[PDB]
Symmetry: C3
């Protein structure tokens, strides 16, 4: 019996131990100390209790699930997935996670320290899957919560390289579910064709979920893949920080986004992206409003580094039959972004900010306002015609740009003959610096191409920092665009040789509450009078001008044109110059035309 | 004897072990390997060495203290507080921590990995307490240091929900003391009525202390609670990053602040706050200047998200009989903040920046300068009368605002008939965007209400981005406010219909070194002369004007008023217009009035 | 035999264990569970397998190397360096690391959890060393990679205080080598005279290497030390975050830099520096371009706090016989920096941004462009003559400044009679706020001292916020500096009493594509005519002026000078004023002179 007890599975339970021989310490057994930790080895055994080695011909799923289920039953703990081994998963889970194509069911308070590698076996080729699932019911609305579940370590989740079998399939790494205080830290997710790597929350249910110091590498690989967002943040008070995202696939340049921020008080910070179509969507979907209300507010995209092929930040909000979503109180700051090398029009239209339609193309459902875009840099190579600081493609209730540096083809753009957004409260401060990479590339183009239904309560203060005489105009409003209660200015620097600076194809600058200024060339004739003598414009399209002043030198000795002008009822400009000697004078002069400024 | 040895507490000390059967590895005993780790179980035992189960009727204090004391004696290590259990504390500690109402005494090099839960028992109801204390003497000035002490894990400190018994009591979670290289990471502090959750340092003594990835939830619950600051940073080279702070109590909206930054080279970054009165104080108290000098400099509040009811950042500095505190070299950047939904005047006056008096109400002791506030967003709902970008309530030696977006009732405010601050070096750049939420709400109010003793070396460049004809003025200086060596401008956009733009109730704009411009309506009469003809203002209050220019169109054919004006000794404006046909002219015109700009 | 087996090193291999008595768990032996972890104790033994205690007379090197080598052979894991002990290293390693003066060779997948202390023994006094080396060959070009190697914990690497023996020696803490997914977290590096603490990558080979939450304290101590950079980042997709850097040595104020960012997609964030010469270099060395190309792009320096004695960020790029390096797409944001207290000229010239020559002094090899410097604060005490926002000492292809607050002696500076940079695309937005600390200190100095060969496509919008009548000028161009296609403006506020505002010593403001404005004092005489009457300047150096306007009041009743002026062919200004009564008038007036603006 002594020997038999010691050799039996209860042997460690008979060997005494006291910490460091301290007579004040608990008199324990070895088993009690070993029981303070737990690994997959404690469950990775045959029906006789003999350990099984992991490998490509072993399905580790049931063993990991048994470990999770047991630790849960004791109120939680942390299960180690050992280093130096690859643990393969080769079958679906059962029960509530089956409605999610789930492999492993996560449980509250049960953390996973992944030090080794978790691979998917070829069972999963061409099939849907969600590797780790925190829902406990196939219907998320009927699911319980997942709380206090953290996945962390130096290890790896490898999706086996398998393509999707059909575009309608879904694949995920970690779905925390209705998740409260859950996180992923340090993990590398790689080698897949998946929809998401990590999802947080469900339709606003959850809180305090985070993804930190994770790597996401090569997670789209086929034309079958319908769509990819690496992290979907669908609960408030949650976010992504200090992560690395990389794709190499052509497909990823057309379909993949790094982050979705879909509920209030969410953030995306300090991360690096390469090879993606898109950086982040910041969106309130009415269809996702159940758990945390109808407003996405306190949305922060800061201090990221990106090389993308489409758009960096995409804003949206939409409606359902019974709910209306709203997006407000957003900050986009400190990001350094560029469109990677590509042919013009070879990926979705390049942009720093996109105001996008809804998923069904509607541009008249959005309620997006109180956005601050400040202190960012954007660059697109000179060949990329389709590059803009903002593509403004749906109704906009406000967006403010201050102190950014935008070096791309367009500043503000929307395609003509497409949507006709209603724009309010678009503010483009004079402190936005417009780069010169695309100088000479702009034939036929307007730098600010105001292809909108209407613009109200808006400010566009254009400041060039180099010449680009190729552009048709600095800013153009088609006659279809109403303009009211707005300030539009074009600083004169680098504009002396421009044929057109600001263009109002419907004469909209004449509006009662339109405040404008821009340079123009004007032909003047004087009267014959020696001495103080009036000069008048030969054209009559200045009835809107409140004052104008000279931007040209006077090469003459015997007279000078007026330094300043106002107008007359018939639309001429008039000012008082000086004839040292009499005579009718005729001059062409560059003027700053001003209205109410 | 073999069997007896094995079953005894030294048994593990007799069972040999060699790592992985490696013949090159140390020949050890099992006990040596078990001795590499340590948990509360190794000390949580009765006088006979039998383990005690934790629970609500067990006081775990003495056992945890014994563990800390023993590990300290070996030069440190990390004690695990096991997952799956709640460890209750039910008595005060003894010795040096007793003067701090202490429960547990922390010791140098002894880290706590809290995986389970630490609860306070009802012994503590209505009483003061500090759960973990790093002082070793009841007099902090006589205390030794705490160094290299880190508290981390997935676990919880729960304060038991108990109210304070008297407002004069103090409660804390972690007081590191005179703390060098100490930190808290990952811990949830919840369910309390406390003064602080964590304090770092003591009166400038300490260094390199941090709070990272912690949660602070529902830490004020009663009207008895005098005051709450969740983290008090009282040593240099220290800070708070990536934390979550939430309150639900009405009381918290009136009393609670998230962070105190009280010594140089301190920071508060990347955190989310909801339900608090205040975000952070940035203060140099003379009474706290012993350990790190009399200056708080290199103070950083960046990239936070907040919903508060009072003020986001509060600046201060003060004096004692023998020490003077100074605050300088501060940056507040990238924050997105809003005043939560509340009635006007129902909480402390809403503000992004407050320049506050000292704790005894004095407004003439401060030395605050070299502050940069840039790239932040602030919003307050339209009903909140008491909302301002800056409430400037005490003497200010400098503060600079660049490229912020402020959407609230006031830009600059101080209450009339209260303090009369002396203001120097207040810079409000034109790149600050003024939102429109409060348009139409401003009857009787001045957007910039300059209720100061004096303003010098200051810049206010007002730029509207929508109309608000309800306001009395854009900026007003009462006659009691001296103004000198300053630049005050009001851009004309959205101002055509304003009765008052800039108001100087003491004619201060006439100062020799005052540089101003703002719009006004002026009535002009001309002489009868055909040809070049002067126009003169009918009022005589323009003796300060250096130039003026038209902001109005000229509806006439037969004449034009001057485009530009200067003045005359008697205070009229004068300019040269043009009478195509003679006659006395009378016009009303909107002018930009300029002085030295 | 039972007893002998149990007492032998295989004893633990005979004692059965089953986790928590769970009948579903693996039937293991105690040794299997102990084998899940590994420490230095498992290798720190004599040839008979008896444990050796560490200490100052024990060389732990061979034991730690044996541990690393063994764990590597099993596919990796984490070796604990135990707390409560100091482990001394006292000899060089052997093999591939010997060409790097290496002590310990790191291996892939083998992490080090340093909880205790690692000290260098006096064997290393006056000698080179690299403590941990990830190269596997003495020739880095012939080295294999290091991957998945993480060093972390609460412990310490102490360099023993030893001085360098010769300036040509190199010393390092961690050289990861050709390093992929390697990191250091939490470690304190202290007490040394070293070249680097940590190097990441080798000549562009590597990826995803990081330094987080580390401390670097007193790592230069002698005049022998040639040069120090605490972290050298020489692989892409890598960076430094949330670290603390401190020096106390006089030598460090002249030689030490905190960070080198030398490859694309690298970052330096959230860190605090004190006592260093320099903050960070951001450089593309042609000599380092092998692994990741010839371009350093996506370079981010954000949200740091620093007290330095030289320059905060230094930009560079250079060439070799066959490679050309390029630097572009850089952002420097949110930093708060100051030059520490020191005498003028007592350390390298103080600067926020330096555009530095190459290591051999060449100023005509650089290709630096697309840089955004925004939302930073800089301060230097008033005595520090040698302090500038930017020292622009080498060719510059672009740099943009928006919304910074610079409080130092110079805004833009280069020494006269030194290099003559070619400058393109230097943009200084009007939103940069110029502080007043150095007011009254600027006798003989130009605030913007444009000591360049040429300036093109540049913008300098000078805005003062207080007077400084000591300065010679706000901006000066020597006649040797060509100026073209540029915008130079001096706002009038605080300039009324300045003798010189903008100075063009070669009359460069007359260029066809130069856009300028600045204040000047001008003497005017009128004709005798009653009524509208011309005024003309008595000097003739205004042939470049397109318009001018009054900045002065008119003290006269009987006449007024013109509000606005243009010029004439002979270089006079001319405008139309008004003589109520006739007579020749003579006045001196402050004008805003304008050219093409
Ligand atoms: C890839 C991506 O994120 N694309 C976003 C786009 O998101 C919408 O389209 C994607 C396409 O993959 C998602 O829609 C697919 O998935 C949902 C959800 O799956 C079901 O519910 C989950 C909980 C369960 O585990 C599954 O087994 C399914 O039963 C399907 O209902 C839908 O038919 C399918 O096309 C995405 O859905 C959201 O997904 C997140 C993350 O898993 C969930 O938290 C949300 O509950 C779910 N929302 C809805 C309303 O169901 C779609 O929302 C965005 O719309 C767009 C703008 O931001 O950006 C990208 O294109
Ligand atoms: C809640 C808060 O932080 N409020 C700040 C306000 O801070 C001042 O008022 C609070 C009120 O709670 C503190 O004053 C109380 O506590 C001090 C300190 O307690 C004593 O010393 C500690 C070390 C010991 O452990 C205790 O047992 C006590 O013996 C009392 O002296 C005082 O009478 C009492 O009202 C706060 O004191 C500071 O507290 C921090 C954190 O613990 C300590 O590091 C400092 O040493 C201590 N300072 C002083 C000068 O004693 C008061 O400073 C701020 O003044 C205000 C502006 O920033 O913001 C909030 O209102
Ligand atoms: C201290 C510092 O970082 N200074 C930078 C300056 O950097 C250059 O000068 C330093 C002086 O210490 C380095 O040059 C010294 O070291 C190199 C490299 O050592 C050799 O290669 C390594 C891999 C091996 O382990 C060693 O045993 C050596 O065989 C010597 O070649 C050189 O002769 C010597 O003066 C620095 O070199 C770079 O160092 C990093 C970090 O270790 C390596 O990753 C690079 O491969 C290596 N580069 C080159 C081209 O060899 C020099 O580049 C910067 O130039 C300057 C501008 O940024 O800022 C600071 O002054
Ligand atoms: Na499903
Ligand atoms: Na329309
Ligand atoms: Na006390
Ligand atoms: Na006064
Ligand atoms: Na070498
Ligand atoms: Na030259």
């Amino acid at each position: 019996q002594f020997r038999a007890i010691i050799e039996s599975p209860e042997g460690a339970g008979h060997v005494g131990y006291q910490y460091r021989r301290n007579t004040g310490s608990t008199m324990r057994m070895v088993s009690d100390v070993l029981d303070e930790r737990v690994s997959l080895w404690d469950f990775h055994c045959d029906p006789s209790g003999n350990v099984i080695q992991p490998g490509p011909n072993v399905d580790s799923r049931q063993y990991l699930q048994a470990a999770i289920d047991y630790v849960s039953s004791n109120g939680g703990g942390t299960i180690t997935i050992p280093a130096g081994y690859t643990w393969y998963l080769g079958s679906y889970g059962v029960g509530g996670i089956a409605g999610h194509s789930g492999i492993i069911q996560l449980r509250s308070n049960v953390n996973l320290n992944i030090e080794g590698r978790i691979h998917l076996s070829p069972f999963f080729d061409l099939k849907p899957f969600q590797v780790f699932v925190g829902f406990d019911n196939g219907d998320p609305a009927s699911s319980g919560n997942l709380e206090n579940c953290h996945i962390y370590g130096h290890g790896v989740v490898d999706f086996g390289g398998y393509e999707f079998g059909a575009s309608s399939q879904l694949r995920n790494g970690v779905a925390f579910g209705r998740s409260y205080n859950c996180s992923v830290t340090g993990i590398t997710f790689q080698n897949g064709d998946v929809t998401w790597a990590i999802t947080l929350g469900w339709n606003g249910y959850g809180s305090n979920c985070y993804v930190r110091k994770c790597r996401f590498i090569n997670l789209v690989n086929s034309s079958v893949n319908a769509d990819h967002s690496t992290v979907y943040v669908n609960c408030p008070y949650s976010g992504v920080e200090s992560c690395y995202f990389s794709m190499s696939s052509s497909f990823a340049r057309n379909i993949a986004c790094s982050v979705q921020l879909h509920q209030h008080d969410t953030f995306y910070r300090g991360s690096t992206v390469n090879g993606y179509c898109r950086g982040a969507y910041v969106v309130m979907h009415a269809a996702e409003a159940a758990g945390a209300g109808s407003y996405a507010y306190n949305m922060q995209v800061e201090n990221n580094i990106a090389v993308i092929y489409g758009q960096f930040v995409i804003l949206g909000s939409d409606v359902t039959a019974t709910v209306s979503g709203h997006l407000n109180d957003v900050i986009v700051s400190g990001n350094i972004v560029s469109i990677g090398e590509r042919a013009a029009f070879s990926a979705p239209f390049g942009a720093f900010i996109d105001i996008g339609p809804d998923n069904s193309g509607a541009s008249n459902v959005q309620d997006i306002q109180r956005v601050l875009v400040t202190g960012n840099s954007f660059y697109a190579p000179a060949n990329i015609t389709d590059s803009a600081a903002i593509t403004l493609r749906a109704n906009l209730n406000g967006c403010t740009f201050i102190a950014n540096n935008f070096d791309c083809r367009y500043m503000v753009y929307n395609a003509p003959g497409t949507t006709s957004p209603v724009v309010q409260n678009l503010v483009w401060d004079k402190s936005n610096v417009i780069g010169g990479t695309h100088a000479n590339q702009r034939a036929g183009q307007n730098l600010f191409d105001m292809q909108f239904a209407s613009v109200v309560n808006s400010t566009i203060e254009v400041q060039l920092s180099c010449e680009d005489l190729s552009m048709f105009s600095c800013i153009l409003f088609p006659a279809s665009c109403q303009l009211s209660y707005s300030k539009i200015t074009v600083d004169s620097a680098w504009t002396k040789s421009m044929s057109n600076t600001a263009v109002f194809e419907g004469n909209q600058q004449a509006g009662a509450n339109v405040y404008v200024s821009y340079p123009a060339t004007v032909n003047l004739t004087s009267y014959n009078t020696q001495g103080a003598v009036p000069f008048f414009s030969t054209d009559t399209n200045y009835a809107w001008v409140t004052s104008a002043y000279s931007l040209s030198i006077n090469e003459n000795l015997d007279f000078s044109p007026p330094a300043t002008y106002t107008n007359k009822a018939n639309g001429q400009l008039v000012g008082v110059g000086y004839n040292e000697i009499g005579g009718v004078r005729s001059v062409s002069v560059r003027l700053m035309l001003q209205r109410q400024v």
